[PDB]
Design a protein around this ligand. Structure first.
Ligand SMILES: O=P(O)(O)OC[C@H]1O[C@H](OP(=O)(O)OP(=O)(O)O)[C@H](O)[C@@H]1O
Ligand SMILES: O=P(O)(O)OC[C@H]1O[C@H](OP(=O)(O)OP(=O)(O)O)[C@H](O)[C@@H]1O
Ligand SMILES: Oc1ncnc2cn[nH]c12
Ligand SMILES: Oc1ncnc2cn[nH]c12
Ligand SMILES: [Mg+2]
Ligand SMILES: [Mg+2]
Ligand SMILES: [Mg+2]
Ligand SMILES: [Mg+2]
Lengths: 187, 194
């Protein structure tokens, strides 16, 4: 791992926390009567980074018997200095309607929050029975617009992290652990 | 699982198998000199069902120093049914070009092979340095079109399997094990869908 300045979390620590987050979620929804086919917890996994987080979480949720529905969405930048408001081009949206459904947006990391806030406001207008967010890493200090995630696996300083789905120039997504990219490397 | 007729593979087994499969891929691509940034093995994950196998496979590949670049594409065929629609819907293609690059398509299951047959043909014309496929499960007793994947984790009998990314009407994708869905469960649902 000589491209990393430090180890933030190992696969094990990540695993543990996810299970804790999943258990909290399960309790929080114990009342909503979530049932397969008719009333599942919809996970709108925001591609690409979220793919790894989403895979381990839906399984943790399953441990706690939470019936889920995976929706993968792919967004795209309109270009630098074109929106500011975090507007993104929807390349692939949910296959099913979220209207009347309990929805949970899944992101691997919230930093400036521009996109996540835009998405939250977007799905919010589609009238789901409820709408919350789960994010693996939260850079609380990086906000460019105010935004609070309902569930967070870990808060992190403003370091550039990689691994567990997170990349730098499309590299390192496959790492089992979350680490900090060495400044020597990204230079 | 009360909705299951049986469990074909548990999480542990799938885990060991993916591990062994990754070692093979590692050895096989050794001579290609895969390197991060300059020459990564391009993994094309076929959403949606491929998401889980893809997540665990790239990590197993990482265990063997295989640098990968991830690509998620989406193509639909069975919809929320039990049988192939026949047609394959290209809803999302690669972000970047695969030309000149070493590419490996990652699929959860190959049955009629209409999907992969469609994919392989599309990508072959784009001239990648190489193109191979890895399928978690092969229901070889189901081809509508011929297709031989370069890596198969497991062969399965002709039965509807769910779990580990694989669904029936967007359900059961989160299971840890791969199990056989009872026909009385989808039958009741299909009827409800009717
Ligand atoms: O709040 P922000 O400052 O936007 O930081 C977090 C976002 O950036 C990343 O997505 P990215 O652009 O890397 O897409 P990716 O998930 O496909 O890698 C990450 O994957 C989160 O979406
Ligand atoms: O070999 P074939 O007979 O083509 O069938 C196998 C394909 O069908 C399924 O995808 P589906 O269309 O169900 O979409 P999904 O991955 O999004 O569930 C499966 O996930 C493979 O893509
Ligand atoms: O530190 C970080 N690493 C990878 N992707 C992101 C997104 N925002 N900030 C990031
Ligand atoms: O057994 C099966 N379960 C889920 N997807 C598919 C596609 N082909 N065959 C299926
Ligand atoms: Mg992201
Ligand atoms: Mg990124
Ligand atoms: Mg598929
Ligand atoms: Mg399917």
């Amino acid at each position: 791992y000589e491209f990393a300045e430090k180890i933030l979390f190992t696969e094990e620590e990540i695993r543990t926390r996810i299970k804790e987050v999943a258990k909290r979620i399960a309790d929080d929804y114990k009342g909503k009567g979530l049932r397969p086919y008719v009333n599942p917890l919809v996970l709108i996994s925001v591609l690409r980074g979220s793919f790894m987080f989403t895979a381990d979480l839906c399984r943790a949720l399953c441990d706690f018997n939470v019936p889920v529905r995976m929706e993968f969405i792919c967004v795209s930048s309109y270009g630098e200095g074109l929106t500011s408001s975090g507007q993104v081009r929807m390349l692939l949206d949910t296959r099913h309607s979220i209207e009347g459904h309990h929805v949970l947006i899944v992101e691997d990391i919230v930093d400036t929050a521009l996109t996540l806030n835009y998405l939250y406001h977007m799905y919010f207008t589609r009238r789901p029975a409820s709408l919350k967010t789960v994010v693996l890493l939260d850079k609380r200090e990086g906000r460019r617009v105010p935004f609070s995630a309902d569930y967070v696996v870990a808060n992190i300083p403003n370091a550039f992290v990689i691994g567990y789905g997170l990349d730098y120039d499309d590299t390192y997504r496959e790492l089992r652990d979350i680490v900090v990219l060495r400044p020597e490397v990204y230079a």
